[PDB]
Design a protein around this nucleic acid. Structure first.
Ligand SMILES: [Mg+2]
Ligand SMILES: [Mg+2]
Ligand SMILES: [Mg+2]
Ligand SMILES: [Mg+2]
Ligand SMILES: [Mg+2]
Ligand SMILES: [Mg+2]
Ligand SMILES: [Mg+2]
Ligand SMILES: [Mg+2]
Ligand SMILES: [Mg+2]
Ligand SMILES: [Mg+2]
Ligand SMILES: [Mg+2]
Ligand SMILES: [Mg+2]
Ligand SMILES: [Mg+2]
Ligand SMILES: [Mg+2]
Ligand SMILES: [Mg+2]
Ligand SMILES: [Mg+2]
Ligand SMILES: [Mg+2]
Ligand SMILES: [Mg+2]
Ligand SMILES: [Mg+2]
Ligand SMILES: [Mg+2]
Ligand SMILES: [Mg+2]
Ligand SMILES: [Mg+2]
Ligand SMILES: [Mg+2]
Ligand SMILES: [Mg+2]
Ligand SMILES: [Mg+2]
Ligand SMILES: [Mg+2]
Ligand SMILES: [Mg+2]
Ligand SMILES: [Mg+2]
Ligand SMILES: [Mg+2]
Ligand SMILES: [Mg+2]
Ligand SMILES: [Mg+2]
Ligand SMILES: [Mg+2]
Ligand SMILES: [Mg+2]
Ligand SMILES: [Mg+2]
Ligand SMILES: [Mg+2]
Ligand SMILES: [Mg+2]
Ligand SMILES: [Mg+2]
Ligand SMILES: [Mg+2]
Ligand SMILES: [Mg+2]
Ligand SMILES: [Mg+2]
Ligand SMILES: [Mg+2]
Ligand SMILES: [Mg+2]
Ligand SMILES: [Mg+2]
Ligand SMILES: [Mg+2]
Ligand SMILES: [Mg+2]
Ligand SMILES: [Mg+2]
Ligand SMILES: [Mg+2]
Ligand SMILES: [Mg+2]
Ligand SMILES: [Mg+2]
Ligand SMILES: [Mg+2]
Ligand SMILES: [Mg+2]
Ligand SMILES: [Mg+2]
Ligand SMILES: [Mg+2]
Ligand SMILES: [Mg+2]
Ligand SMILES: [Mg+2]
Ligand SMILES: [Mg+2]
Ligand SMILES: [Mg+2]
Ligand SMILES: [Mg+2]
Ligand SMILES: [Mg+2]
Ligand SMILES: [Mg+2]
Ligand SMILES: [Mg+2]
Ligand SMILES: [Mg+2]
Ligand SMILES: [Mg+2]
Ligand SMILES: [Mg+2]
Ligand SMILES: [Mg+2]
Ligand SMILES: [Mg+2]
Ligand SMILES: [Mg+2]
Ligand SMILES: [Mg+2]
Ligand SMILES: [Mg+2]
Ligand SMILES: [Mg+2]
Ligand SMILES: [Mg+2]
Ligand SMILES: [Mg+2]
Ligand SMILES: [Mg+2]
Ligand SMILES: [Mg+2]
Ligand SMILES: [Mg+2]
Ligand SMILES: [Mg+2]
Ligand SMILES: [Mg+2]
Ligand SMILES: [Mg+2]
Ligand SMILES: [Mg+2]
Ligand SMILES: [Mg+2]
Ligand SMILES: [Mg+2]
Ligand SMILES: [Mg+2]
Ligand SMILES: [Mg+2]
Ligand SMILES: [Mg+2]
Ligand SMILES: [Mg+2]
Ligand SMILES: [Mg+2]
Ligand SMILES: [Mg+2]
Ligand SMILES: [Mg+2]
Ligand SMILES: [Mg+2]
Ligand SMILES: [Mg+2]
Ligand SMILES: [Mg+2]
Ligand SMILES: [Mg+2]
Ligand SMILES: [Mg+2]
Ligand SMILES: [Mg+2]
Ligand SMILES: [Mg+2]
Ligand SMILES: [Mg+2]
Ligand SMILES: [Mg+2]
Ligand SMILES: [Mg+2]
Ligand SMILES: [Mg+2]
Ligand SMILES: [Mg+2]
Ligand SMILES: [Mg+2]
Ligand SMILES: [Mg+2]
Ligand SMILES: [Mg+2]
Ligand SMILES: [Mg+2]
Ligand SMILES: [Mg+2]
Ligand SMILES: [Mg+2]
Ligand SMILES: [Mg+2]
Ligand SMILES: [Mg+2]
Ligand SMILES: [Mg+2]
Ligand SMILES: [Mg+2]
Ligand SMILES: [Mg+2]
Ligand SMILES: [Mg+2]
Ligand SMILES: [Mg+2]
Ligand SMILES: [Mg+2]
Ligand SMILES: [Mg+2]
Ligand SMILES: [Mg+2]
Ligand SMILES: [Mg+2]
Ligand SMILES: [Mg+2]
Ligand SMILES: [Mg+2]
Ligand SMILES: [Mg+2]
Ligand SMILES: [Mg+2]
Ligand SMILES: [Mg+2]
Ligand SMILES: [Mg+2]
Ligand SMILES: [Mg+2]
Ligand SMILES: [Mg+2]
Ligand SMILES: [Mg+2]
Ligand SMILES: [Mg+2]
Ligand SMILES: [Mg+2]
Ligand SMILES: [Mg+2]
Ligand SMILES: [Mg+2]
Ligand SMILES: [Mg+2]
Ligand SMILES: [Mg+2]
Ligand SMILES: [Mg+2]
Ligand SMILES: [Mg+2]
Ligand SMILES: [Mg+2]
Ligand SMILES: [Mg+2]
Ligand SMILES: [Mg+2]
Ligand SMILES: [Mg+2]
Ligand SMILES: [Mg+2]
Ligand SMILES: [Mg+2]
Ligand SMILES: [Mg+2]
Ligand SMILES: [Mg+2]
Ligand SMILES: [Mg+2]
Ligand SMILES: [Mg+2]
Ligand SMILES: [Mg+2]
Ligand SMILES: [Mg+2]
Ligand SMILES: [Mg+2]
Ligand SMILES: [Mg+2]
Ligand SMILES: [Mg+2]
Ligand SMILES: [Mg+2]
Ligand SMILES: [Mg+2]
Ligand SMILES: [Mg+2]
Ligand SMILES: [Mg+2]
Ligand SMILES: [Mg+2]
Ligand SMILES: [Mg+2]
Ligand SMILES: [Mg+2]
Ligand SMILES: [Mg+2]
Ligand SMILES: [Mg+2]
Ligand SMILES: [Mg+2]
Ligand SMILES: [Mg+2]
Ligand SMILES: [Mg+2]
Ligand SMILES: [Mg+2]
Ligand SMILES: [Mg+2]
Ligand SMILES: [Mg+2]
Ligand SMILES: [Mg+2]
Ligand SMILES: [Mg+2]
Ligand SMILES: [Mg+2]
Ligand SMILES: [Mg+2]
Ligand SMILES: [Mg+2]
Ligand SMILES: [Mg+2]
Ligand SMILES: [Mg+2]
Ligand SMILES: [Mg+2]
Ligand SMILES: [Mg+2]
Ligand SMILES: [Mg+2]
Ligand SMILES: [Zn+2]
Lengths: 151, 140, 59, 112, 101, 116
RNA sequence: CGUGAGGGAAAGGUGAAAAGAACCCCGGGAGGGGAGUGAAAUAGAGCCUGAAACCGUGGGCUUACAAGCAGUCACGGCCCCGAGGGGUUGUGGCGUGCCUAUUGAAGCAUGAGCCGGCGACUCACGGUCGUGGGCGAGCUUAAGCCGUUGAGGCGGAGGC
RNA sequence: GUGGAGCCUGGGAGUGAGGGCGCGAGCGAUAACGUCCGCGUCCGAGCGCGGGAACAACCGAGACCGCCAGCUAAGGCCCCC
RNA sequence: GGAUGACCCCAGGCGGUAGGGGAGCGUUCCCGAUGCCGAUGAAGGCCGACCCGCGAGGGCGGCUGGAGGUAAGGGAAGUGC
């Protein structure tokens, strides 16, 4: 704290409480006791745990009938309205939130600005994103790499 | 069901002839009569006892040698101001007070106990001035 | 001396009970027989300058 | 109908003035004026003026009749205090509060 | 006529038309119950020894409730012992139907 | 994140002060003095519920006594007699009788004199 | 503030917009009362909200024969709201502040004028028990590298 | 003898200023609201409740809450009560 | 008893300082949330003799206030004077 270390007044005989300096947390304007300092909240969750979590996350959406794999994306070539077309053809009105996993950039860029769509490259597949969304939509290309990461 | 509480009732006047009675033994009974504890609707927080006229206080009686040995005592608040008055002398100078002081000490202390002492009227000699209330002559 | 000092803060009730004698009494006034104005008795009327039924002082 | 005046921030002490205000509560306008005139106190000046402003309002803004007017309410409030140093013996400084008043007079009409 | 009846460990003087709260009775609201009798009074006088044999008072149960909350508080000095408990005693509300003497 | 006192403390003092409404001087005005007063009031309360059960019984007893000595016996003899008779009317109810229904009470007196 | 080295504060908020109140009235002024502006002026500049201590006016109840840790329990009177509640308190019963420190405090032992806000068991890395899970004669990566731009993976050196 | 009994392995303590009373001793003066031990008890922590005028440790008794119900304990029952 | 916190019946325990253990209340912040409550009135402030909870509290309603607030379930602390 910015203040100095001087004893503001003598120890005895003033008729006031004894104090040292005004950096003491007991003073308004003094330093704070056990406040936060910078911290690293990260830790190494076991790899196998992450893997099972990734398996189960997808498996859950499968049991729900919510997992859908697609072969390709028709005429969607970067324009959002194109995705919306394709969406409809596959049952995606947007009454349900979707996690779209594909390596095709132009599909991701199209679908991205939507409120109800989250977009991922397959190496980015992760369980928080899986649980967040009501429906899982994966390119075959993606499903293959998801396969590699879990076995 | 909550306990009965009387409405303010008319107090009976009562007459007692103190002649020849024992000082303290008369006293307890006057106190009881003053509280009103002889009344089934007794209530401790209101003045509802009887009024008591007493005559012949000067001819009250006491046992043992207390005539010369009962000392009544009074402190004035000044240094050396504790006067001592033997029973004999109190009879001879303010006889009615012997009975009064005895009764006073047997009533509860506090504002209510002090008003019940007022309801007691003590006379030396055969007579009193309370004809107007036509007091009922009790035995005790 | 040993610097006497109050032992307890005085209650609102007791400070105000000390003040139970502090009320001002209204000034005592009588009409002036000439100009009817209210004035202290036994003083020269400061409105019209009369006292004792004659003009005494220039108001 | 009522008419009022308030003198806010008068540099006199609330407790002192109230003494004077106590004299006029419930008097006719004529009586209070008389009383104030011969009250040997500083605050009688200030109360006089708050009164006269109120009577002005009553007559001139509120269709009341000067000759029906009476002090229906009057009260003194305490405003912000002025803090000043009063230097004492042996290096010590005391702090004097120079106190302040918000003076109010409220006039009504006495019917009949 | 009145009757002295005994319910919930306590006794009460009751009469036709009387509303009474007593310790909660195990009885559906609207139902009817017979209270034991210790003494009948008024015109005739019969003294129970302790109860009277033929007698009973009928009561229609109006319903059950919880009383106004009492704050039961505890405190011990120089020990930091303090407790605050809230209490509402259950009751049953009865109307006295008849004194079957 | 920092959690200042904010709103919480005021609301705790108010709770107390309301409970203290009606107390003299600072005892309804200062939070601290209220709390002292309320500890007393709480132990006084609890104790006085207990004590109230006693207090009334003692009044019931004094009352039964007066109406007993109207028929030539004392409370102590009375209670003995009812006891032998098997009359279990409580002192609360006896008292109502002694004032409200003096005939019925006299009867109870009768039975108690009989029972010994 | 200190000779000096040096110490070292307090102090944010009208309104959407100044539309910041022409003009008249009392006043020396301050201040106010009207008029006016504004959705709002106890938003009027001593300006969002406006708690508490604290001071005041008005109203109900109450108090000048009364003995008190100030309450509580009972009853009665008066006042308010409409077989009930609320306020007040005459009488009666009971009744030794809080905290701290102590063998023991109402204690004539400590601390506290009162109110508001600040104010004291934390975090990192190791360790040891317990616990929720992953794998199991196995378990696990560190720095780093790649990818993301709040996406995760690789990395077996090493540790148990 | 099934008890907030007992034993074993581990985690967390606090305490390591006691005090009155009864009995058995030493010290002192067959002194101290004295001191130091032994067995016990209560207070400590039961300064909650009844009795002892008032009073931690004497007598009665181990307070979960509510009731305008009943029986008792010590102690009491002429009035205060 | 039903079958595993569904509730019911019966029985016992429930004074407490140091201290051990258990279960909760609330404050700031994050996920829930491109959501939802909000000018037909956010937060906060002042009331209530009303409701729910053993309690810490949580509702509801009237007045003030004038633009924010944030659920079920979880996460993290500058968390209660
Ligand atoms: Mg520094
Ligand atoms: Mg500096
Ligand atoms: Mg420095
Ligand atoms: Mg330094
Ligand atoms: Mg130094
Ligand atoms: Mg220094
Ligand atoms: Mg010193
Ligand atoms: Mg000092
Ligand atoms: Mg000081
Ligand atoms: Mg100091
Ligand atoms: Mg110092
Ligand atoms: Mg310091
Ligand atoms: Mg220092
Ligand atoms: Mg410092
Ligand atoms: Mg420092
Ligand atoms: Mg700082
Ligand atoms: Mg600063
Ligand atoms: Mg700073
Ligand atoms: Mg701090
Ligand atoms: Mg620190
Ligand atoms: Mg520090
Ligand atoms: Mg830290
Ligand atoms: Mg860092
Ligand atoms: Mg950690
Ligand atoms: Mg790390
Ligand atoms: Mg979403
Ligand atoms: Mg999106
Ligand atoms: Mg007699
Ligand atoms: Mg009594
Ligand atoms: Mg004489
Ligand atoms: Mg006496
Ligand atoms: Mg007494
Ligand atoms: Mg001297
Ligand atoms: Mg001197
Ligand atoms: Mg000298
Ligand atoms: Mg001096
Ligand atoms: Mg002093
Ligand atoms: Mg004061
Ligand atoms: Mg006052
Ligand atoms: Mg005084
Ligand atoms: Mg004249
Ligand atoms: Mg004068
Ligand atoms: Mg004029
Ligand atoms: Mg001062
Ligand atoms: Mg000053
Ligand atoms: Mg029963
Ligand atoms: Mg019940
Ligand atoms: Mg204690
Ligand atoms: Mg204490
Ligand atoms: Mg105490
Ligand atoms: Mg304590
Ligand atoms: Mg202690
Ligand atoms: Mg305590
Ligand atoms: Mg409490
Ligand atoms: Mg704060
Ligand atoms: Mg704080
Ligand atoms: Mg607060
Ligand atoms: Mg608090
Ligand atoms: Mg608040
Ligand atoms: Mg609160
Ligand atoms: Mg009061
Ligand atoms: Mg007060
Ligand atoms: Mg006061
Ligand atoms: Mg106040
Ligand atoms: Mg109780
Ligand atoms: Mg008691
Ligand atoms: Mg009992
Ligand atoms: Mg007899
Ligand atoms: Mg018996
Ligand atoms: Mg019996
Ligand atoms: Mg210097
Ligand atoms: Mg200088
Ligand atoms: Mg310096
Ligand atoms: Mg400073
Ligand atoms: Mg600053
Ligand atoms: Mg603004
Ligand atoms: Mg602005
Ligand atoms: Mg002008
Ligand atoms: Mg002018
Ligand atoms: Mg002007
Ligand atoms: Mg004006
Ligand atoms: Mg103006
Ligand atoms: Mg307008
Ligand atoms: Mg509007
Ligand atoms: Mg306002
Ligand atoms: Mg405003
Ligand atoms: Mg201001
Ligand atoms: Mg604003
Ligand atoms: Mg303001
Ligand atoms: Mg203000
Ligand atoms: Mg205020
Ligand atoms: Mg007043
Ligand atoms: Mg007298
Ligand atoms: Mg009087
Ligand atoms: Mg006394
Ligand atoms: Mg009574
Ligand atoms: Mg009452
Ligand atoms: Mg009432
Ligand atoms: Mg009392
Ligand atoms: Mg006691
Ligand atoms: Mg005391
Ligand atoms: Mg004591
Ligand atoms: Mg305290
Ligand atoms: Mg403390
Ligand atoms: Mg302390
Ligand atoms: Mg000490
Ligand atoms: Mg010491
Ligand atoms: Mg000592
Ligand atoms: Mg004292
Ligand atoms: Mg003292
Ligand atoms: Mg000292
Ligand atoms: Mg002290
Ligand atoms: Mg010391
Ligand atoms: Mg000071
Ligand atoms: Mg104060
Ligand atoms: Mg404070
Ligand atoms: Mg720790
Ligand atoms: Mg572990
Ligand atoms: Mg694993
Ligand atoms: Mg190692
Ligand atoms: Mg045990
Ligand atoms: Mg054990
Ligand atoms: Mg066992
Ligand atoms: Mg631990
Ligand atoms: Mg240790
Ligand atoms: Mg220790
Ligand atoms: Mg020692
Ligand atoms: Mg030792
Ligand atoms: Mg020892
Ligand atoms: Mg021991
Ligand atoms: Mg002793
Ligand atoms: Mg012996
Ligand atoms: Mg011995
Ligand atoms: Mg020995
Ligand atoms: Mg000798
Ligand atoms: Mg010793
Ligand atoms: Mg000895
Ligand atoms: Mg010895
Ligand atoms: Mg011992
Ligand atoms: Mg200790
Ligand atoms: Mg004991
Ligand atoms: Mg023990
Ligand atoms: Mg006693
Ligand atoms: Mg005792
Ligand atoms: Mg005792
Ligand atoms: Mg004891
Ligand atoms: Mg027990
Ligand atoms: Mg009941
Ligand atoms: Mg018995
Ligand atoms: Mg015995
Ligand atoms: Mg005795
Ligand atoms: Mg007796
Ligand atoms: Mg049980
Ligand atoms: Mg248990
Ligand atoms: Mg316990
Ligand atoms: Mg447990
Ligand atoms: Mg909180
Ligand atoms: Mg919580
Ligand atoms: Mg913040
Ligand atoms: Mg943040
Ligand atoms: Mg959001
Ligand atoms: Mg939002
Ligand atoms: Mg809406
Ligand atoms: Mg609007
Ligand atoms: Mg509104
Ligand atoms: Mg909030
Ligand atoms: Mg907030
Ligand atoms: Mg609330
Ligand atoms: Mg609000
Ligand atoms: Mg905004
Ligand atoms: Mg939230
Ligand atoms: Mg939540
Ligand atoms: Mg979560
Ligand atoms: Mg802190
Ligand atoms: Zn003249």
């Amino acid at each position: 704290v910015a203040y100095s270390g001087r004893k503001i007044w003598p120890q005895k005989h003033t008729g006031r409480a004894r104090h040292g300096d005004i950096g003491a947390p007991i003073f308004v304007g003094g330093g704070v006791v056990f406040g936060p300092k910078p911290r690293d909240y990260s830790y190494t969750l076991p790899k196998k745990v992450r893997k099972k979590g990734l398996a189960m996350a997808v498996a859950d959406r499968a049991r729900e009938g919510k997992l859908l794999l697609v072969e390709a994306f028709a005429g969607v070539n970067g324009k959002t309205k194109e995705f919306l077309a394709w969406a409809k053809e596959a049952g995606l009105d947007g009454s349900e939130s979707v996690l779209l996993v594909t390596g095709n950039e132009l599909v991701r860029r199209a679908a991205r600005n939507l409120p109800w769509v989250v977009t991922l490259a397959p190496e980015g597949l992760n369980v928080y994103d899986i649980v967040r969304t009501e429906r899982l939509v994966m390119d075959l290309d993606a499903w293959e790499v998801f396969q590699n990461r879990i076995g | 069901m909550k306990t009965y509480v009387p409405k303010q009732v008319e107090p009976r006047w009562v007459l007692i002839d103190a002649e020849g009675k024992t000082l303290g033994r008369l006293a307890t009974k006057i106190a009881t009569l003053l509280r009103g504890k002889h009344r089934p609707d007794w209530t401790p927080n209101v003045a509802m006892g009887d009024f008591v006229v007493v005559v012949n206080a000067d001819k009250i009686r006491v046992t043992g040698k207390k005539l010369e040995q009962k000392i009544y005592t009074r402190y004035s608040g000044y240094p050396g101001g504790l006067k001592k008055i033997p029973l004999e002398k109190m009879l001879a100078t303010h006889p009615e007070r012997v009975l009064e002081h005895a009764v006073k000490g047997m009533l509860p202390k506090g504002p209510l106990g002090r008003r019940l002492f007022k309801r007691l009227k003590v006379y030396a000699g055969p007579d009193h001035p309370h004809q107007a209330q036509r007091p009922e002559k009790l035995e005790v | 001396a040993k610097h006497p000092v109050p032992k307890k803060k005085t209650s609102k009730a007791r400070r105000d009970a000390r003040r139970s004698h502090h009320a001002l009494t209204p000034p005592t006034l009588v009409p002036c027989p000439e100009c009817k104005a209210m004035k202290p008795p036994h003083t020269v009327c400061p409105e019209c300058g009369y006292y004792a039924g004659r003009k005494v002082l220039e108001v | 109908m009522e008419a009022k005046a308030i003198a806010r921030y008068v540099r006199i002490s609330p407790r002192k003035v109230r003494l004077v205000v106590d004299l006029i509560r419930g008097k006719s306008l004529e009586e209070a004026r008389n009383i104030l005139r011969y009250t040997n106190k500083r605050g009688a000046y200030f109360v006089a003026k708050v009164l006269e402003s109120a009577a002005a309002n009553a007559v001139n803004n509120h269709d009341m009749l000067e000759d029906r007017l009476y002090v229906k309410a009057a009260y003194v409030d305490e405003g912000p205090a002025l803090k000043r140093v009063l230097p004492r013996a042996r290096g010590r400084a005391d702090i004097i509060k120079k106190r302040t008043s918000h003076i109010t007079v409220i006039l009504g009409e006495k019917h009949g | 006529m009145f009757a002295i009846v005994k319910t919930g460990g306590k006794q009460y003087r009751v009469e036709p038309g009387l509303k009474l709260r007593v310790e909660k009775l195990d009885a559906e609201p609207g139902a009817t119950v017979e209270l034991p009798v210790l003494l009948l009074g008024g015109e005739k006088t019969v003294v129970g020894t302790p109860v009277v044999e033929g007698a009973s008072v009928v009561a229609e149960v109006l319903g059950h409730g919880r009383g106004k909350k009492i704050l039961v508080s505890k405190f011990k000095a120089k020990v930091q012992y303090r407790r605050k408990k809230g209490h509402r005693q259950p009751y049953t509300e009865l109307l006295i139907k008849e004194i079957r003497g | 994140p920092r959690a200042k006192t904010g709103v919480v403390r005021r609301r705790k003092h108010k709770k107390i002060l309301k409970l203290a409404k009606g107390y003299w001087g600072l005892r309804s005005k200062s939070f601290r003095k209220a709390r002292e007063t309320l500890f007393a009031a709480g132990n006084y309360a609890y104790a006085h519920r207990k004590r109230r059960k006693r207090d009334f019984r003692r009044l019931w007893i004094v009352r039964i006594n007066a109406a007993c000595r109207q028929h030539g016996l004392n409370y102590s003899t009375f209670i003995h007699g009812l006891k032998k008779a098997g009359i279990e009317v409580d002192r609360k109810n006896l008292a109502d009788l002694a004032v409200r229904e003096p005939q019925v009470f006299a009867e109870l007196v009768e039975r108690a004199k009989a029972a010994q």
